[PDB]
Write a protein that binds this ligand. Structure first.
Ligand SMILES: Cc1ncc(COP(=O)(O)O)c(CNc2cccc(C(=O)O)c2)c1O
Ligand SMILES: Cc1ncc(COP(=O)(O)O)c(CNc2cccc(C(=O)O)c2)c1O
Ligand code: NA
Ligand code: NA
Lengths: 402, 401
């Protein structure tokens, strides 16, 4: 009855193809598997462990709140939720927040809100949502239909309608499809899944202008790119384009299942009692942990450190390219890094990831052509050098015949 | 200072929370900011199935919390596989998927039923049959499968091919089902819908019709699962085995966690990348749910749920004898609904508020029904104390006459 990679196939729905090793312990930006093999973690569980594994402050918040109160339901409010809400409100454009459990749920709330606001303020026919090719917004039927990857939205029966997709960064295309029957434009300021592509300033400002013109709400999905990832608290702050609604998850709780939807009072008022809800959403345990996380991430020193560390990674990636000639582009913001493979290595991202893991380093992909890095925002310089040397080793092994 | 007014300044106006704010819980007692003590018969809507800060759950939280919280589903993890094995061993399930809420578990179940039909039968086999008054969550898809139009209206185009008929109306289901039907989705006991239990004939009938039409029978046990009814799952009480089952709430005793349970044959319809989750199935949630499962799935705890139900029922009967307020006491195990007599129709919220004033937390199940969903291990002493408080509350409401 030992637990092995084979056990996965016997137990879990076949929706994942997990690695051949099972991480069992983590500390900072290091992880150990069952055999005690050590890995440097540049993946962050896909940009989630923004303060690494078992950060003492987050462990302390978890344990202390864990002794006090976990859950009371939204029949009630609670102190950690209200404290966290205040912090988000003070630090951002938001005037009101709703807490949920996952990015998908935050997006569901955001999209329902944009829909309902249009229904109540303007017209029940103002239903069109504009989104972008390659977008990822979650796995619910509604959110995956707003997502821009048909491979993930096909095959589940009738999709919720009135969603139009155009290319990311194509402002003309957005102008062309938008009208007085449009309720929302939904965009990731950096498409994390779709090759780590950042919105251009003209594009993002243009979305703000078009939403103003058409009385549509601009929704920023900052599930991946928010909570310090870009080296600003939220990516919108880098761009200086303020959305109507913003969603946050992943880094928000440093690994704890939590998410948030942020908006203004005027927009929040379109919801009435019972318009939306959640059993677990905004429970005091999640909110205590996310509070601790927020308090660390939202400091000048940590935010500056994110840029320092980005350049430490970028310098290694450039050195790897000088030696092995494998990258055409190194992009992203802060500690969301994408490195696009040259045409010679098109479709090989998964192979470099696999070789990385063999070499003791966890990395990501962003589609089949792009390597992705989303380490802890406080990853130690020593871990960056050690892990990037392991990665350079993996690259060397892969390109040996080429 | 954090007050009730603070909520109005901070959270979307989707809730109208009580004027008091719980800050601490231990077992089935809760304290607010003023230090007022409450007996908890609400369980945060049937979630804290082992009460607040149960030592075993706190232990599991702390132990895993100092080890590993999250690695993403790029990897599996020991707690997820341990918990999966436990659920598989104890139920009809052969495979599971962990998610973060009941809504998410239902999303997974409904997408799976749809996808299984598409790949195993026909892309046109899309009809989902569900029931009036059903509650399945708040996502656009799940609220559309839910049977309360008030909650699904007003969000733009709903996902199509969902048909609603009355709960417990087997004839109506037979009438709407055909070869183009992919699923029948049902709560074995409708919790939010007045605490209405399925009849044996209705549930066994759904199984037969699903077999006839090659549709999947999906039990939403988010509320009635994980010991709530005095069996591990309500389907076990009924002896009707569904094709897919969803679980949340009690599963994590307060921790955000949920599960979708099915057979290998059905699970195999999904391919890699068909569904997924960032947080779903993380080792922390699974460690806590594992500890919860290990406690709830014992003969003693499950026997106790029935002893305790009768303790509640007897008090509710004593209250009706004194005050003439209840027409029916129903539900299963420690999901209890007490329907109000005609004279008190629509006033369940009045009794809930009087309850809170009197130091006892209770629920409603629509405007005509009082609902109780305490910890499955609630102490006899707390049942008596909370029920005497509730009796004082009823006395106060009746006295205004
Ligand atoms: C931009 C974005 N939006 C929404 C979600 C949905 O969040 P939840 O999973 O918590 O429901 C996500 C994250 N969802 C997700 C899941 C698996 C992989 C990846 C990846 O970026 O490779 C992303 C995301 O990255
Ligand atoms: C049968 C059922 N199905 C799905 C859900 C959705 O679960 P989540 O909330 O974890 O996403 C629920 C519970 N959802 C829920 C929320 C608020 C109130 C009530 C109530 O029964 O009064 C129920 C439920 O009771
Ligand atoms: Na603000
Ligand atoms: Na089994």
């Amino acid at each position: 009855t030992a637990i092995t990679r084979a056990t996965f196939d016997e137990v879990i729905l076949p929706v994942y193809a997990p690695a051949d090793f099972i991480p069992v312990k983590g500390k900072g930006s290091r992880v150990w598997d069952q055999q005690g093999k050590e890995y440097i973690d540049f993946a962050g569980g896909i940009a989630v462990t923004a303060l690494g594994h078992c950060h003492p402050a987050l462990v302390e918040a978890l344990k202390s709140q864990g002794e006090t109160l976990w859950h009371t339901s939204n029949v009630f409010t609670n102190e950690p939720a209200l404290r966290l809400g205040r912090k988000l409100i003070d630090a951002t454009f938001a005037e009101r927040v709703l807490f949920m459990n996952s990015g998908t749920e935050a997006n569901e709330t955001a999209f329902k809100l944009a829909r309902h606001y249009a229904c109540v303020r303007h017209s029940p026919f103002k239903t069109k949502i504009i989104a972008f090719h390659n977008a990822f917004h979650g796995r619910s039927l509604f959110t995956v239909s707003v997502g821009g990857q048909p491979k993930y939205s096909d095959g589940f029966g009738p999709k919720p309608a009135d969603i139009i997709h155009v290319p990311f960064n194509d402002l003309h295309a957005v102008k062309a499809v938008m009208d007085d029957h449009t309720c929302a434009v939904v965009v990731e300021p950096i498409q994390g899944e779709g090759g780590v592509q950042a919105a251009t300033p003209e594009f993002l400002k243009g979305l703000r202008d078009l939403c103003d013109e058409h009385q549509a709400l601009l929704v920023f999905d900052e599930v991946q790119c928010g909570m310090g990832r870009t080296g600003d608290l939220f990516a919108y702050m880098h761009y200086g384009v303020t959305p109507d609604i913003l969603t946050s998850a992943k880094a928000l709780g440093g690994g704890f299942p939590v998410s948030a939807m942020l908006t203004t009072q005027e927009i929040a008022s379109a919801f009435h009692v019972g318009s939306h809800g959640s059993t677990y959403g905004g429970n005091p345990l999640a909110c205590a942990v996310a509070g601790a996380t927020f308090d660390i991430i939202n400091t000048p020193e940590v935010l500056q450190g994110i840029h320092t560390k980005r350049q430490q990674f970028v310098q290694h990636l450039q050195a790897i390219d000088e030696q092995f000639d494998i990258f055409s582009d190194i992009r992203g913001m802060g500690l969301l890094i994408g490195a696009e493979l040259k045409p010679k290595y098109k479709g090989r991202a998964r192979d470099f990831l696999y070789a990385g893991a063999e070499a003791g380093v966890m990395v990501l992909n962003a589609g089949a052509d792009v390597m992705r890095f989303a380490p802890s925002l406080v990853v130690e310089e020593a871990d960056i050098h050690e892990g990037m040397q392991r990665f350079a080793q993996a690259v060397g092994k892969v390109v040996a015949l080429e």
